[PDB]
Amino acid sequence: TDSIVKASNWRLVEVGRVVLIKKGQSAGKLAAIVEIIDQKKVLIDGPKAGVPRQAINLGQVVLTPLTFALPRGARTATVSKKWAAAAVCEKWAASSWAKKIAQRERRAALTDFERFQVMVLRKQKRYTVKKALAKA
Amino acid sequence: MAHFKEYQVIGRRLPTESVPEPKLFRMRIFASNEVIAKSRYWYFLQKLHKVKKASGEIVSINQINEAHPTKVKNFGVWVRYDSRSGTHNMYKEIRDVSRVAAVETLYQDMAARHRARFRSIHILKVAEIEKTADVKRQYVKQFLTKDLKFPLPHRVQKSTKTFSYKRPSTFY
Amino acid sequence: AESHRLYVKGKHLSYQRSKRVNNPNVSLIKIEGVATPQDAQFYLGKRIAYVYRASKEVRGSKIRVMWGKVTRTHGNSGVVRATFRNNLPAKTFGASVRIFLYPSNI
Amino acid sequence: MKYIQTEQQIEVPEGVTVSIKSRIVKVVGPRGTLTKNLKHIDVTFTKVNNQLIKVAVHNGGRKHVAALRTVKSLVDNMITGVTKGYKYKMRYVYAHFPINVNIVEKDGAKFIEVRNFLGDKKIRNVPVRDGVTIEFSTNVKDEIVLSGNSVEDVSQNAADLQQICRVRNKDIRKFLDGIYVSHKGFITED
Amino acid sequence: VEPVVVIDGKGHLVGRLASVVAKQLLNGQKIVVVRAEELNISGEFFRNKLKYHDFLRKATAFNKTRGPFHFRAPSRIFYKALRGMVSHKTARGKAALERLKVFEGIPPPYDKKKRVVVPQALRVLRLKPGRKYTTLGKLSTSVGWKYEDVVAKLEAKRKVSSAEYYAKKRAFTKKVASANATAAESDVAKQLAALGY
RNA sequence: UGCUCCACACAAUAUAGAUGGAUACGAAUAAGGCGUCCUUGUGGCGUCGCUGAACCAUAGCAGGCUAGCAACGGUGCACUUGGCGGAAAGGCCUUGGGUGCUUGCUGGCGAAUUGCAAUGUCAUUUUGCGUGGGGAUAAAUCAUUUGUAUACGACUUAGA
RNA sequence: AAGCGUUCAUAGCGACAUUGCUUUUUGAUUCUUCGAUGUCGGCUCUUCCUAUCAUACCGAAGCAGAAUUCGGUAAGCGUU
């Protein structure tokens, strides 16, 4: 007696959609969609991350699941307070996506002696877990 | 050149012994630098008054940028565009953030829509639409409705390598 | 360990050349994974060697070797220009040449 | 032009259940069930209360947005195939030689045959699709009723009759002979 | 990075796939193409036939046994899209075609090895959504190649055997991940998390 | 004392190009993967993707010697039980045992003179002389001839 | 599309024009060969083109059927 259909959830484009810029002078900072121009150009502001409030083509940014409500056509300070109030940044870092990007760059910075540590460290975690597989 | 800038221009006839202190015409010009703007001024005053730049002079040149250069707004813009077999007036309404950035878009798509280069486009007047519900283009009114929400499906993904291994997804 | 290379691999592309003219003076090299001339200068300037096997030994090694220096970036894809003390025999098209890490610049 | 959004409403009566993943649909109701592919439409489906289905397109061109109305006109056609069914009552009009059709089973495969058409001995067997049942409407002369759920298949069969009885090499406009659909009805009257 | 890569052409533009393969050959990469029957070409299938018959008719007149050999196999029609696509006349080009092995379907032993793909030539990424694409698996059947059924069951046989391979792999993959989490949170991982792993 | 195949040299030439690892579902993408759960699905719920920058592995005279500790593993090496696999299978996987190494941990031992870098060589072929074992013991052609064949070839014959 | 075509401009047409293609005609010219490229027609021999004569399938009509005429895909098959 039940009809089943799947909405196939997307990352919606709206004023209040937290975004990640990909390429350009920023190239990796966070921002909120201030106001859309068209399907290919929006407005972004980065008061929490130093990104100047600007209009950018979507091609240089990628959307995020993050969601928070704030008025359209807002100003920088208005963006800031809701950004601080909703605690978007901290829960952004709480996203598994944030760790992956961070450890990616954390990996890009680790030095040779750190590399040698992991060489040993990976073998320790190897042996400890391998015996468990052997016991399994 | 499309990185245009609105160079405001004032120009006047050369002083003459009969009538000095001439009329001092003024114009806003959309151009990629000071230089093209200077002559683009001269092109327009070449039309509406009996003056050539040799017989006239440019009293001043200055730059223009919007008072709130990061505020979206709707533009009502007139233009005459030289057709393949003639010329027609033309009234588009484009919604862009900067006055110049509107023309950056407008010169681009007019070249797309009717193959009119930057050469023959004569912006009669740019009129930023001061309020809503007064435009008459549906593709803009659909951006004037409330709570504009929609997905961007079928996301493209650039690849820095010629090879992948994932059969990449497309969800967005 | 199991790897002993202290160089980064390099696939030799081709001559420095126009449509219908080629120049043996300069040859093009691609390093795996290198992307842009923004970070191609890291490989720029290093001594690079073309190792190959000869039918008969000459000087205590059947493995004769060719010496050359990578000079400058090329294009926007990380291809670099390299001059060799002896120009490549043009059989090297698609051959993996070694890209040493010296002269060090760090 | 690419309207950023376009919307259509699917009115599903309470007697029909719907299952849609990807672009494959399957209704379930008292009449039966129907399954149809839509892999070539590029649309989106969503729901309000399991009575209204909301189909939509985002950023679709004019040629694209046309299809969005079509599929709604397709899926509700699915409903009527499973809440009403489609009745196609036919007419055997002929000038002098009456039309004879033979409900005949060749070998496990049902075909409807056209005989006596213009006194001709052509074995004009025509296949009949699934769920499409053939019944001679009694008490009224020269009708055949094609009953089935899928409007497409029942109509496609009836269309096949139109062409298979098509008189040739004659000025048809007065050779009014042949087979013709009197009405595009429904299995139930509601 | 891998000298010999099994490239899969599923949902890949034949032209775009050709170039990203034309390059790799001339760089010297060993290239083996698989699943070649169901490659994709952009255009309506009916018109994809017409342009072939136009090419099919094109042949030398005085001796039709020495003109352009109009190959029909899906692998070979792709292969022709590599000749001319690569400077075949010269020896270097001849060696390039030497180091290329186009293999319709998935013949052994590549089935038991990884089928790399090309991000660039993908139909999903490149085609505007809703545009008319065309698989060569049906075209070659429509234009003379006569082995659609035999490869259909053969690929069917490989897929059902391979699926079990993955089913066995997922079972072991589950247990290694389960042991991973079980042994995780340990102080060793704590350095790894801080260090970058 | 011919020939072939198994082991080894070694000598030759020969290399369209080894110098960590082809690290194996399919399908779809306006959708899935994975995991949990079941009123088993076109299911519930959750996670995830947004680049292979990943996974493994990787420390030791170019990878030597020696001792010990926590274990019952990895891991060669071949053996062996088997299975799988005919699309070009020629490989995959598994049982069990032995073997060496183990850097999981601690120690100790030797590294030097190529003297400031000089690829500082480490592969993959095939043959040829031979090592020292295995296997095995024929055809074809000319010439004679037959014609279903034929310009000549060729073909088709027959002939201890 | 003026008119014919009973009535109806466009079934068939189609005046007055007007826009294309062709080298199967013949033009104009002289780029090629004057220290030789054998020149008509016929015989026979074959392929190709379609701008279709019949042939397959259709459509139209001032096409009752036949004969019809126009038109479409069509060069496979023929054309004494």
UniProtKB/Swiss-Prot annotation, chain A:
Localization: Cytoplasm
Record carries keyword Membrane: no
PTM: N-terminally acetylated by acetyltransferase NatA.
One BP term from GO: maturation of LSU-rRNA
Cytoplasm recorded as keyword: yes
Signal sequence range: none
Top-level taxon in the UniProt lineage: Eukaryota
Chain coiled-coil ranges: none
Molecular-function GO terms, alphabetical: RNA binding; structural constituent of ribosome
CDD domains: eL14
GO cellular component: cytosol; cytosolic large ribosomal subunit; nucleolus
Keywords noted in UniProt: Acetylation, Cytoplasm, Ribonucleoprotein, Ribosomal protein
Record InterPro entries: KOW, Rib_uL2_dom2, Ribosomal_eL14, Ribosomal_eL14_dom, Translation_prot_SH3-like_sf
Binding partners and assembly: Component of the large ribosomal subunit (LSU). Mature yeast ribosomes consist of a small (40S) and a large (60S) subunit. The 40S small subunit contains 1 molecule of ribosomal RNA (18S rRNA) and 33 different proteins (encoded by 57 genes). The large 60S subunit contains 3 rRNA molecules (25S, 5.8S and 5S rRNA) and 46 different proteins (encoded by 81 genes).
Family listed: Belongs to the eukaryotic ribosomal protein eL14 family.
Note: Present with 45300 molecules/cell in log phase SD medium. There are 2 genes for eL14 in yeast.
Name listed for the protein in its UniProt record: Large ribosomal subunit protein eL14A
Species of origin: Saccharomyces cerevisiae (strain ATCC 204508 / S288c)
Curated annotation (Swiss-Prot), chain C:
Pfam families: Ribosomal_L35Ae (PF01247)
Sites of N-acetylalanine modification: 1
Residue(s) of cross-link: Glycyl lysine isopeptide (Lys-Gly) (interchain with G-Cter in ubiquitin): 46
Domain of life: Eukaryota
Chief location: cytoplasm
Location(s) in or outside the cell: Cytoplasm
Function: Component of the ribosome, a large ribonucleoprotein complex responsible for the synthesis of proteins in the cell. The small ribosomal subunit (SSU) binds messenger RNAs (mRNAs) and translates the encoded message by selecting cognate aminoacyl-transfer RNA (tRNA) molecules. The large subunit (LSU) contains the ribosomal catalytic site termed the peptidyl transferase center (PTC), which catalyzes the formation of peptide bonds, thereby polymerizing the amino acids delivered by tRNAs into a polypeptide chain.
Anything else known: There are 2 genes for eL33 in yeast.
Subunit field text: Component of the large ribosomal subunit (LSU). Mature yeast ribosomes consist of a small (40S) and a large (60S) subunit. The 40S small subunit contains 1 molecule of ribosomal RNA (18S rRNA) and 33 different proteins (encoded by 57 genes). The large 60S subunit contains 3 rRNA molecules (25S, 5.8S and 5S rRNA) and 46 different proteins (encoded by 81 genes).
Protein name per UniProt: Large ribosomal subunit protein eL33A
Organism of origin: Saccharomyces cerevisiae (strain ATCC 204508 / S288c) (Baker's yeast)
Swiss-Prot record, chain D:
Complex and partners: Component of the large ribosomal subunit (LSU). Mature yeast ribosomes consist of a small (40S) and a large (60S) subunit. The 40S small subunit contains 1 molecule of ribosomal RNA (18S rRNA) and 33 different proteins (encoded by 57 genes). The large 60S subunit contains 3 rRNA molecules (25S, 5.8S and 5S rRNA) and 46 different proteins (encoded by 81 genes). uL6 lines the binding pocket for eukaryotic elongation factor 2 (eEF2).
Gene Ontology BP, a term: cytoplasmic translation
Species, as recorded: Saccharomyces cerevisiae (strain ATCC 204508 / S288c)
An example molecular function term from Gene Ontology annotations: rRNA binding
Misc: Present with 52400 molecules/cell in log phase SD medium. There are 2 genes for uL6 in yeast.
Name assigned to this protein: Large ribosomal subunit protein uL6A
Gene that specifies this protein: RPL9A
Lineage, broadest ranks: Eukaryota, Fungi, Dikarya, Ascomycota, Saccharomycotina
Protein function: Component of the ribosome, a large ribonucleoprotein complex responsible for the synthesis of proteins in the cell. The small ribosomal subunit (SSU) binds messenger RNAs (mRNAs) and translates the encoded message by selecting cognate aminoacyl-transfer RNA (tRNA) molecules. The large subunit (LSU) contains the ribosomal catalytic site termed the peptidyl transferase center (PTC), which catalyzes the formation of peptide bonds, thereby polymerizing the amino acids delivered by tRNAs into a polypeptide chain.
Recorded superkingdom: Eukaryota
GO cellular component, one term: cytosol
Swiss-Prot record, chain E:
A single Gene Ontology CC term: ribosome
Cross-link (Glycyl lysine isopeptide (Lys-Gly) (interchain with G-Cter in ubiquitin)): 175
Lineage top rank: taxon: Eukaryota
Post-translational modifications: N-terminally acetylated by acetyltransferase NatA.
Pfam family, any one: Ribosomal_L13
Compartment(s) where it occurs, according to its Swiss-Prot or TrEMBL record: Cytoplasm
GO biological process terms on file: cytoplasmic translation; maturation of LSU-rRNA; negative regulation of translation
MF term (GO), any: RNA binding
Keywords: Acetylation, Cytoplasm, Isopeptide bond, Ribonucleoprotein, Ribosomal protein, Ubl conjugation
Family under the similarity heading: Belongs to the universal ribosomal protein uL13 family.
Subunit structure: Component of the large ribosomal subunit (LSU). Mature yeast ribosomes consist of a small (40S) and a large (60S) subunit. The 40S small subunit contains 1 molecule of ribosomal RNA (18S rRNA) and 33 different proteins (encoded by 57 genes). The large 60S subunit contains 3 rRNA molecules (25S, 5.8S and 5S rRNA) and 46 different proteins (encoded by 81 genes).
Note, other: Present with 43300 molecules/cell in log phase SD medium.
Protein name, UniProt field: Large ribosomal subunit protein uL13A
